[PDB]
């Protein structure tokens, strides 16, 4: 399966995906890394790994659909099968999400359905949970509302901040995101016609 990773920041999940997909038994190959920000560590990790890169600036497109269309064009040029959102901090349009239904994964730093949205660690800390985690899911039109592929629980420790909790959750993210990509790329997990998740 040919994989595109879309990034926006440091790309520690990108690095985890690079590491696992280079293993001999990987059913996925990362063929392109796409960023909406042109000076991010993620781009450098891709270049270090010999992966082509492309930067798409919203400042050249009139709307989301136009911008996602630019992404989609690069995906088609690279004959991409699967899209991983790895710290990608834009919201995707309906048609783009519709087109990639069942073929786009996202990593979210909470145990969904808890703490949907942008500041999941702050939400978890304000709520007082003692257990949080991360979730790999298929991307649906409702943000953080697609089918769940894998999750991993992570303890919250007294005195945690966004800094320390995100650090601990990310170790978990670096495990389930590669596993999830491997499950989808091998066809072991798929989105069934009923929109439910199938283990084959």
Ligand X SMILES: NCC(=O)N[C@@H]1O[C@H](COP(=O)([O-])[O-])[C@@H](O)[C@H]1O
Is 66 annotated as belonging to a binding site?
no
Beta partners for 10? Answer: none
Q: Is 154 exposed, middle or buried (0-12, 13-18, 19+ CB in 10 A)?
A: buried
Tell me which of 1, 5, 13, 184 binds ligand X, using CB under 6 A: 13
Stretch that binds ligand XSI, among 64-72, 115-123, 163-171, 178-186 (CB under 6 A): 115-123
Shortest separation between residue 76's beta carbon and ligand X, angstroms = 25
Map residues 67-86 to x or -, x wherever contact with ligand X holds by CB under 6 A. Answer: -------------------x
Which one of ligand X, ligand XSI, none interacts with residue 154, CB within 5 to 8 A by kind?
A: none
- Using the contact rule CB under 6 A, the part of the chain among 25-33, 61-69, 106-114, 156-164 near ligand X is 106-114
For the chain, what is the HEC assignment? CEEEEEECCCCHHHHHHHHHHCCCCCCCEEEEEEECCCCCHHHHHHHHCCCCEEECCHHHCCCHHHHHHHHHHHHHHCCCCEEEECCCCCCCCHHHHHHCCCCEEEEECCCCCCCCCCCHHHHHHHHCCCEEEEEEEECCCCCCCCCEEEEEEEECCCCCCHHHHHHHHHHHHHHHHHHHHHHHHCCCEEECCCCCEEEC
The binder of ligand XSI chosen from 113, 117, 187, 192 (CB under 6 A) = 117
Choices 28-36, 52-60, 84-92, 125-133; region in contact with ligand XSI by CB under 6 A? 84-92
Is 108 a known active-site residue? yes
Residues forming the site for ligand X (CB under 6 A): 9-13, 86-87, 106-109, 120, 170, 173
Binding region: 11-13, 64, 89-92, 106, 140-144, 170-173
Catalytic residues: 108
Residues annotated in the binding site for (6R)-10-formyltetrahydrofolate, as ranges?
Answer: 64, 89-92, 106, 140-144
């Amino acid at each position: 399966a040919r994989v595109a990773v879309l990034i926006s920041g440091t790309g520690s999940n990108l690095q985890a995906l690079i590491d696992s997909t280079r293993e001999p038994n990987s059913s996925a190959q990362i063929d392109i890394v796409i960023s909406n920000k042109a000076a991010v560590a993620g781009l450098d990790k891709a270049e270090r790994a010999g992966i082509p890169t492309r930067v798409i600036n919203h400042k050249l497109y009139k709307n989301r659909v136009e911008f996602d269309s630019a992404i989609d064009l690069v995906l088609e040029e690279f004959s991409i099968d699967i899209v991983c959102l790895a710290g990608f901090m834009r919201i995707l349009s309906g048609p783009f999400v519709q087109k990639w239904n069942g073929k786009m994964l996202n990593i979210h730093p909470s145990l969904l359905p808890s703490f949907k949205g942008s500041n999941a660690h702050e939400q978890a800390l304000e709520t007082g949970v003692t257990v949080t985690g991360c979730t790999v899911h298929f991307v649906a039109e409702d943000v953080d509302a697609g089918q769940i592929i894998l999750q991993e629980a992570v303890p919250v420790k007294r005195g945690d901040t966004v800094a320390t909790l995100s650090e601990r959750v990310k170790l978990a993210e670096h495990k389930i995101f590669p596993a999830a990509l491997q499950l989808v790329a091998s066809g072991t997990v798929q989105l069934g016609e009923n929109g439910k998740i199938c283990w084959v």
